[PDB]
Enzyme design. Structure first.
Site, PDB file in Angstrom:
ATOM      1  N   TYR A  85      33.371  34.739  37.445  1.00 38.61           N
ATOM      2  CA  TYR A  85      31.962  34.454  37.650  1.00 38.61           C
ATOM      3  C   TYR A  85      31.484  33.318  36.749  1.00 38.61           C
ATOM      4  O   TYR A  85      31.479  33.443  35.524  1.00 38.61           O
ATOM      5  CB  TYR A  85      31.146  35.718  37.382  1.00 38.61           C
ATOM      6  CG  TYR A  85      29.680  35.621  37.740  1.00 38.61           C
ATOM      7  CD1 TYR A  85      29.250  35.802  39.050  1.00 38.61           C
ATOM      8  CD2 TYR A  85      28.726  35.372  36.764  1.00 38.61           C
ATOM      9  CE1 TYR A  85      27.905  35.725  39.380  1.00 38.61           C
ATOM     10  CE2 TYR A  85      27.382  35.289  37.083  1.00 38.61           C
ATOM     11  CZ  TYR A  85      26.977  35.469  38.394  1.00 38.61           C
ATOM     12  OH  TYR A  85      25.643  35.392  38.725  1.00 38.61           O
ATOM     13  N   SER A 175      38.318  39.547  36.701  1.00 37.78           N
ATOM     14  CA  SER A 175      36.885  39.810  36.799  1.00 37.78           C
ATOM     15  C   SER A 175      36.399  39.617  38.231  1.00 37.78           C
ATOM     16  O   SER A 175      36.790  40.367  39.128  1.00 37.78           O
ATOM     17  CB  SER A 175      36.102  38.908  35.845  1.00 37.78           C
ATOM     18  OG  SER A 175      34.720  39.226  35.873  1.00 37.78           O
ATOM     19  N   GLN A 176      35.550  38.618  38.451  1.00 36.12           N
ATOM     20  CA  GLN A 176      35.098  38.314  39.804  1.00 36.12           C
ATOM     21  C   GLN A 176      36.300  38.062  40.711  1.00 36.12           C
ATOM     22  O   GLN A 176      36.322  38.487  41.870  1.00 36.12           O
ATOM     23  CB  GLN A 176      34.171  37.100  39.820  1.00 36.12           C
ATOM     24  CG  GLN A 176      33.692  36.733  41.215  1.00 36.12           C
ATOM     25  CD  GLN A 176      32.888  35.447  41.250  1.00 36.12           C
ATOM     26  OE1 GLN A 176      31.748  35.432  41.711  1.00 36.12           O
ATOM     27  NE2 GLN A 176      33.479  34.359  40.759  1.00 36.12           N
ATOM     28  N   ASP A 263      35.990  46.332  26.616  1.00 36.93           N
ATOM     29  CA  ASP A 263      35.352  45.376  27.515  1.00 36.93           C
ATOM     30  C   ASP A 263      33.887  45.749  27.733  1.00 36.93           C
ATOM     31  O   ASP A 263      33.581  46.855  28.175  1.00 36.93           O
ATOM     32  CB  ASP A 263      36.095  45.331  28.851  1.00 36.93           C
ATOM     33  CG  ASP A 263      35.589  44.234  29.763  1.00 36.93           C
ATOM     34  OD1 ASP A 263      34.404  43.860  29.654  1.00 36.93           O
ATOM     35  OD2 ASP A 263      36.377  43.743  30.596  1.00 36.93           O
ATOM     36  N   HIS A 292      36.886  41.675  27.558  1.00 40.00           N
ATOM     37  CA  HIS A 292      36.894  40.846  28.745  1.00 40.00           C
ATOM     38  C   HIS A 292      37.491  39.498  28.384  1.00 40.00           C
ATOM     39  O   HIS A 292      36.789  38.509  28.244  1.00 40.00           O
ATOM     40  CB  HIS A 292      35.461  40.683  29.236  1.00 40.00           C
ATOM     41  CG  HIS A 292      35.344  40.415  30.700  1.00 40.00           C
ATOM     42  ND1 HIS A 292      35.440  41.406  31.647  1.00 40.00           N
ATOM     43  CD2 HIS A 292      35.124  39.269  31.378  1.00 40.00           C
ATOM     44  CE1 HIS A 292      35.288  40.881  32.847  1.00 40.00           C
ATOM     45  NE2 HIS A 292      35.096  39.586  32.710  1.00 40.00           N
TER      46      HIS A 292
END
Lengths: 311, 312, 311, 311, 311, 312
Positions: A85, A175-176, A263, A292
């Site tokens: 993201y 992630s994204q 995270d 993260h």
């Protein structure tokens, strides 16, 4: 402790028309001719040919990204890579080239609006700073509808390349990217394998009470600017159509996941939720001391996973 | 130094086709019929009638916001109020109603995409998180092109209202709102007066070097993601078409401004730059101890300013 | 301001015995047999063989790190890669393998005491938390003396490898790595080329006044604990023997540098200082919007630089 | 909360060779001749004489520290004071002098490598920034092995002084100092009394999960850089040889402790753990509103305790 | 910059009635009878007697503080110690005793309202959180008027003690304490010597522009709440009556000062201003690496200074 | 946790002489002649007259604030507004005027020492930075004793105004203001209605354990400086005389409250505690995504509440 987390399987939010919305959205995608385009791109690398790949997707937006191929007679195994993201720097060309150097014809799809693709969808009304809440008041207009469909087409495009072995295509991302990897796998049978590092867009209704950093907070931020109790209801309603906990059920590819126990962007619970809704050959690598961030240990994990399924 | 700031007047960045671009843009706006819509809205207040106002603008986008009118036989003086960047909460209905209670038929235009209007413009390519860099690679596609034009139409719409005295319309706003206030005044002769609090979108080429906080830094953030030197050039090029230092020259309405000397969002220099490019009956209220925040002292300042010019 | 920086060239702090100290150090190192040790290591990669490399250096310390070689007929161009201060994760094996995939037989030397090598040198007295001030009261005992010498030997070891083309060896690194790259090049004629990203250990006497972040502040921190004015004198004295501004004069290899104008760890001034003391075929890539972080645009810069000089 | 803390007593982690390791270590210490040195040191005070004390200890390291004696005919009660982690400023001379003014011939031992003494022990391999993980892969090479032994010798040296009443020697310190105080008392019968503020190095396996602040976090940091699961096991193994919960069992001196309930550096639980493993004349002063800082109340508490037992 | 600071001497802000205001204020103080009160107090120390001292000051407020005397036939030299702003913990007893142990009959006056004395003065109107702006709209009602006068009386009281040598009384303190030390010396001939660590209350008109931390910011905070511009003027008017730059002119005692060049609470400039306005035998110790904190190096400095002049 | 919070009702800490203390305190207040003073004040607004109101209260201290009245023939409904802790800017004149524009003759009482009234009470001994712990060692000397009494008198004063309908007086405020609103209502029958946003000074013994932000922490800070165990005992003792959980029992007026579930200044638990000790016509509006800040949604809530009860 982490015993309660391994056991966490929130209740799904999928609505009755969940499958029909996606079947209907796939039918709109099919409506658009891909019109794929390739253009050689110069990069200081040996043993790899780099290209600019273009194709048309939902709503007739043009999607782009770099496509790197092992400079050797194919056919080759392929990877569709999805970036994080707001975390696409120079189209992540260096990572893409490196993947190709590993023997994978790999395409880094740029997410419409953030990365360097085109988002053709109108913005219905106001929304919080970011993409998270754009078109949030309807699953038809929601930002990730288009992006999800772009992922499916990405697979359809590369799969048609003569140098690509259609039966050895993997989908990966963090992630994204991980969410797109899973979503794509859930909506398409093309991908043989899935690798998601701490996946995003998962368990929205909890991710909101637990996230301590952007961009899950964009939703909170949106609800602070629109207090209408009906707005919140509609928002979570449309979000359920894209929540991994509702899509995980459709994934039958072998899938490998990672999560760091500290995270704060993509909370462990939300990731476990996704994992526990998978009913397929799966595995979750858990890292006590990581958040993260790039997890070295997991890198080598997914290299084996990919090598053992695609090479 | 307040001294150095008082004399700061950067060279304009306006490109040679600056005027043409806006003439052409205004002509595209004229192309769209406003077809305004009103709808009574219930709100717990006496002496004021609240409405939902709707109209069409550039790219055929539906623009909205609350419209509050003093519940008394007009015609009334009017205000078009513009909200701050990403700072529209519940359409700022409470502020709008309060303005009406002050005797002003006031409309709070919601900025397309953030507030609650509709942004119809395509997103050409990638951009940094936020609106700042959306369509940044061309002045035709740039985010604020549409919004600027929405502001002009806002004035055109409310000016046609029978209860509104077209000769007594003021334009006000803070930060982003202040920029829209100035831009609107610069592109339209409708507004009689302008009130801008620490205005935004001003002196971009310096803002990017002095801003310690969001979101002038979305631009910086955009360049980090797109290192191409040709991208930066094009970006600053398109930005000059919307920079207050280039528009200030067109403002002939009496205008009142404020700035806090410790403002880190909208740096004093960028605001002085705008002010020093105004060639009209103007005034800049300077507050040593305030930043990008509600300045109580200035609130009463603009009440007088507005009262003297609009409640005459 | 870029203008002031471009012309910034502080007076050297090199003491009169500068050259002697290094000749005598390079000599103590010649005293130790390298006694290299190679050991194959399995890694999920194709086309590259990975090894654990071991050798003895100054003080009879055993230095270690991963050594990845292109799995194809030699000889190959080689890279010695140096990691950042306290920034070695899993011996940076993934980066090393990737370099090998680019066609370089590359060795990632682990910094003694930091990354995975052995620091045999005694700790003379107290010092601030970190390595910066360890043995600071004498250039004979200073931490970076050993590490600098380890870098020279690193070049000596890989240069003797049959698969390595001794006349095509490059030295690269970021921050601390960049400093070691430059120092190594300055003390050895082995390396043909130098790439340094925002180099560290440069212009100490200014760094301590402009640094807003660790670890240059370790020096400041050390002085807070030891107020003796003599201590500060001696400290800066020993530091001059390792300061890039004093070593840059010896670098004759073509060298490429980078610096982000908002870098707060390794202040632009300190990096320009180093660059302006180089008297060789050189170039400084300046990035207005970047700090002490991976700079995508520069990565492709150094790939070309390395490719044209080594491939 | 306080209720559960009072009853918190984690299982010991002491390995089967715990006693042997320390017997062998003490034997190695005995191997090194003390050969202590004294040197008068001018300091602006009246009623006190200040000296620089030197002696040799484990590994042949010269340990130093200021030694202040009441300027009155002896013999005197004595204190061996230990400073905090990375918290030794100017050898804490002012505190030492003040202790002497209270009637105690007191020696402030500087912790080798940080405080102002010499650490002769090699650095086996990489480790996290700080001392916490230096030589962590073996109890023979671990940093605190040497320091612990230095503490024992400190007592042996000051006990031989004619002006010192060997029967009235106290051992005190805060945080790291408190741990050394306890460790020393546990390994030596010399000290008659123990006073430790919020002791450090205690209950490592929990500290790493509850600490929100350095430096118990250096361990976590070390594991992030070395993901090998074996590494973590070995690390906690060697740490158990120095953990207060395993040493507390040997303390037979009356001991007084303090702990602030909002301490985030040295978490209350870890301190209670230590206290609940002491099986002697112990007392634990609990302060609800204090963290890891000077606690005025406890100051006067330990003055009485010391006066009662030593004066 | 040390250069610019050395030469920094802002124009005085003292109003034309400056002297009269203080003459009148001292007259009001004389109006109140001391009626001092001593009460023995138990403390774990030997060679020192501790007391609770009480007296009446301006406005009939009861001022208190611990009074520690060397347990030895006098007369003794004396110190009146002033604590920091909001930094009095337990009446700062441990430090008063420690000062006595140094041979000084020392009294730690508690600042009214904060420390533990009594502030009898009405609060005229609103003010910012803290003491800084209490009664700010008039020099008659200003908070520090009473406190300044309390300091003068402190000297008058202890000076009358038979065990105290009136000719050998010193006044010391840090930050707020340093300001009170200077103010007291400026308003009274009793003190023979002055020691102020980074004095507070000085160059108000600049402090408000350079202070990055409390509590000079209370003034700024006060103006944010009261925008009336006449208000800022009246405030700065009353503040000039207490500003060190205006009082420094009256100090004829030998005085020693300290300042850390990174002090953000009490900015170097404001401290230099005060020292450059002193026309007495003065000296300023400058510490490059210290801020608003205990400076070990200076500690020993003032011990010598005090010992030379008082012992 | 909403379920645990909804059922949270801590045991009262009220000491046996709780009622007597307040009876005696009210008696002392009655001892002081009001002697209220009015002074027209200029402000750029139409339809509202602004005044500066003065009167004498407990300890013979002058209490003050702005008094804005709807510029029309009364009698009018009235509001006594209380400001937040250390959050009074320019006497909050703009808010006061706005309330008057809503049809309420409203007086913004300035809290002694904070906003702009006089605190005649001596400072017994040391205390932590702030007002929280001033005179903390005795309920007779405690800071909020005077302020609480000032609130009661405020009601007594405005109620005597001919333009004010004594039967339609409301008491409102946020944080500290909300606490004063409740306290006032608990100690006086004058107010017909109560509106409190995230009330303060509630459930002290828990606040000190859950507050992550100032100023409940001033108490903690005070104990760090005074370690004497007998000091803590006395402090919490005197605090119980002013704790909302002990006063809530006396509130008979219909009262409306708000609380944001992420409020770190005024923790939800402490607010629920107060609410659950109310035994009257009451309601608690709960907002999941808000902290200790202006809650737009609740604004409109209290406008209706006030309109229904005071404007009928």
């Amino acid at each position: 402790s982490l015993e309660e987390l391994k056991k966490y399987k929130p209740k799904k939010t999928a609505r009755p028309d969940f499958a029909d919305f996606w079947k209907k959205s796939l039918e709109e995608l099919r409506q658009v001719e891909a019109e794929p385009t390739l253009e050689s791109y110069d990069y200081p690398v040996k043993g790899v040919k780099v290209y600019r790949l273009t194709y048309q997707s939902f709503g007739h937006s043009k999607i782009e990204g770099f496509y790197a191929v092992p400079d050797q007679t194919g056919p080759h195994p392929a990877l569709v890579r999805f970036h994080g993201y707001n975390a696409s720097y120079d189209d992540g060309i260096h990572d893409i080239v490196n993947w190709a150097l590993h023997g994978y014809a790999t395409f880094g799809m740029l997410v419409r609006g953030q990365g360097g693709s085109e988002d053709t969808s109108v913005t219905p009304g106001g929304h919080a700073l970011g993409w998270m809440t754009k078109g949030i008041l309807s699953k038809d207009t929601y930002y990730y509808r288009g992006v999800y469909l772009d992922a499916v087409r990405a697979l359809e495009v590369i799969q048609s390349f003569p140098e690509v072995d259609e039966h050895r295509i993997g989908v990966i991302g963090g992630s994204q990217g991980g969410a797109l990897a899973i979503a794509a796998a859930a909506l398409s049978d093309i991908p043989k394998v899935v690798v998601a590092d701490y996946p995003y867009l998962s368990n929205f209704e909890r991710a909101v009470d637990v996230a301590l950093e952007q961009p899950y907070l964009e939703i909170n931020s949106y609800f602070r600017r629109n207090s209408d109790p009906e707005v919140e209801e509609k928002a979570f309603e449309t979000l359920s159509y894209f929540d991994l906990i509702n899509l995980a059920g459709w994934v039958k590819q072998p899938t490998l996941m990672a999560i760091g126990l500290i995270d704060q962007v993509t909370p462990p619970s939300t990731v476990f939720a996704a994992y526990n809704h998978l009913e397929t050959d799966k595995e979750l690598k858990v890292y006590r001391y990581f958040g993260h961030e790039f997890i070295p240990a997991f890198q080598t994990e997914k290299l084996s996973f990919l090598q053992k399924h695609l090479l």
